[PDB]
Ligand binder design. Sequence first.
Ligand SMILES: O=C(NCCCCc1nc(CO)c[nH]1)c1ccccc1
Length: 304
Amino acid sequence: VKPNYALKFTLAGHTKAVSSVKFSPNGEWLASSSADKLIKIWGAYDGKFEKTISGHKLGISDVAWSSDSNLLVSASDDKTLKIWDVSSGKCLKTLKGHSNYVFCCNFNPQSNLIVSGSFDESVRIWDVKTGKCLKTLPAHSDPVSAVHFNRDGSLIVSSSYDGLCRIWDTASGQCLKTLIDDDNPPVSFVKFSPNGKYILAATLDNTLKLWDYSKGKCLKTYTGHKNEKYCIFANFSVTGGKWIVSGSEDNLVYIWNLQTKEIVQKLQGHTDVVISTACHPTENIIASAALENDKTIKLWKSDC
Ligand SMILES: O=C(NCCCCc1nc(CO)c[nH]1)c1ccccc1
């Protein structure tokens, strides 16, 4: 079986490259971040522009939702993260400490913590309530491309242009595991599978790999897309068929069968690198976003 994702909405408004799109956990909203220093909120189902959230002094690389869909965190080239009240659009805290661009951020499931990755080669864990840094992990020896909590928040995974994926005990900040192959191409993206047993990792050799966390083994490889330059997000689609979803530097959205590794669909429409894709938490909906020749978000819908 293949999905049949078709274009429903093109979301225009960003004046520079989009960097990241993410659906709210309640499925209501899409949040977008951009080089234009703005966060935009859009209706997930009708594509309707809701509001602009402003305050960062330089471009935003990443945005992430709290579990209750009430807060956003953004990661900025201004070396800060900002926690936002989405309803008011107000900046609640500025997270200060990173010594270079903040690239990537995520809330833990409880949403009492935020994890961030920076070009400063550190991973930081922040208290949402106080806005204070709790820990600095000396995580990598090159820029940190991604950070993610597992399903219960007990673990962090990070990836770096140093070619490593590392798994961290959240409570202690101690490294549990380093995923190395024999080569070490830059790791441009990582996240845990919904059940937290696997890690999906992108490398800048046009390759996605599914890793067994517990064993430290590669189970699956997904190829045929273009990824040698950008930190392109990848997703587990779980609402219909079990797919892998990724953008591509050839301006397409790739969708693979998770088990077979076959490409099942290629979504044509963007006029630049598809940097970010997000899978809706309950509907067969994909959001895709493109760099500065395009600057649009596209919403797609499938019957499976
Ligand atoms: O990908 C780059 N710029 C596009 C915007 C950021 C996309 C992004 N991906 C993630 C994955 O965690 C977070 N944010 C980039 C790559 C190399 C050097 C400078 C910038």
